[PDB]
Amino acid sequence: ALHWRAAGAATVLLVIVLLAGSYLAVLAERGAPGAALISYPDALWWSVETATTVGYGDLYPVTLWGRCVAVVVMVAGITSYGLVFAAVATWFVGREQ
Amino acid sequence: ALHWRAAGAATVLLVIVLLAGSYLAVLAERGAPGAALISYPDALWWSVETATTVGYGDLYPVTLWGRCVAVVVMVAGITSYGLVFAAVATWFVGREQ
Amino acid sequence: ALHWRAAGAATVLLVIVLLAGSYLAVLAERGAPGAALISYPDALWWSVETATTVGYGDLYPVTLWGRCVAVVVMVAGITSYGLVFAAVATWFVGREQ
Amino acid sequence: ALHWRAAGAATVLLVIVLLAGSYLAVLAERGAPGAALISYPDALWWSVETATTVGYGDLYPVTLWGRCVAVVVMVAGITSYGLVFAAVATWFVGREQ
Amino acid sequence: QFTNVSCTTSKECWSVCQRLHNTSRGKCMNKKCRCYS
């Protein structure tokens, strides 16, 4: 019992880092040459994509802070998603019949 | 037996959520300040990329609905793709000889 | 053995589909005012990114053919990459000590 | 023990290839009709995203060298990330309680 | 900045930005090329 919980909990991390980063970068990018967000309603959306290795492009980070969030959210989003990919593998093995 | 079917079926999910989301967002983005998600012929293409963690950038969501679809299609696309990544792992273990 | 060869060979697929798709779309996009995929030297680069779930944005296939290649190259790139992700998992298990 | 170390070390690779590639492409892209990226403070950021299959779009290297780095950093970033995805799978199996 | 700029290539998208106001480097959107800093 771990592949399940570990995966289920992983989702929480990505969720947290998502909001945090968004607001973290916003406060910065807000006052500096950055993407077209200058707010959470827009930034939050950027974090979500960045977390899912998406990164549309319509709004990308530039400033140190803004960029720092992208990397922070990326590792968090991937980590949470990874546990899920491996979680299924563990359970997939426990089903010979 | 599961890693095979589970993976094969997973592809179906991504396929469904793809079309659905596209049309779901279109109806919305159609009458809102968005990139170019007004028609299905174009939106559908956007969903496909978003599902494969691609997101070129040309066609990106902006409105709540339009954006909501991106996230919905993202989770679906990744989930279907994930099962495949893990599916091979399970079978990969059963081939010592 | 299989996780090794399967992964090593997978790389070949992505390589093939890459060139093919590029040239396949080029011939099409070439005569379709909308995307910057008229020359191989440029298209080939687009296929590579699309195969690695990258999709910078500079080249966003629009025409049916051009777009068709993106999806074809995407599945190929991911498939080849997937086998590698799972390949390591199989071998990772055979090293408890 | 391998799934752990292998994964922990993998992160190092992506880190190295990241900086290297960035500087490698910069020296090139810096002087050539490729993209805008003509420095490390900016290039480095591009490599990070490219390594995480992100590729926002703000930076689209066209030149041979500049483009070569993208592919080099992509394989490195994915390889390091892959080991992590599989690493968790191996450990995930060693937990029935 | 985001104005009504044609969308065909990236190499040209820059020349337009510099000409319009005084910027460069900008992705291309299905609608219109967007200018960035």
Swiss-Prot record, chains A, B, C, D:
- Intramembrane: 40-50, 51-58
Residue window of motif Selectivity filter = 53-58
The answer to keyword Phosphoprotein applying to this record is: no
Query: Transmembrane residues, as ranges?
Result: 6-28, 66-89
Q: Where in the cell is it found?
A: Cell membrane
**Keyword Transmembrane helix: yes or no?**
yes
> Principal place where this protein is found?
membrane
Which is a Gene Ontology cellular component entry for this protein? voltage-gated potassium channel complex
**Residue ranges annotated as Extracellular topological domain:** 29-39, 59-65
As recorded in UniProt, coiled-coil segments are none
Keywords from the named record: Cell membrane, Ion channel, Ion transport, Ligand-gated ion channel, Membrane, Transmembrane, Transmembrane helix, Transport
Please share what else the UniProt entry notes about this protein.
The amino acids 62-79 are situated in the membrane and are important for channel structure and properties.
Domain description: The cytoplasmic C-terminus is involved in the gating mechanism.
Its annotated function is as follows:
Acts as a pH-gated potassium ion channel; changing the cytosolic pH from 7 to 4 opens the channel, although it is not clear if this is the physiological stimulus for channel opening. Monovalent cation preference is K(+) > Rb(+) > NH4(+) >> Na(+) > Li(+).
Name this protein carries in UniProt: pH-gated potassium channel KcsA
Q: Which organism is it from?
A: Streptomyces lividans
Shown portion of the whole protein? 23 to 119 of 160
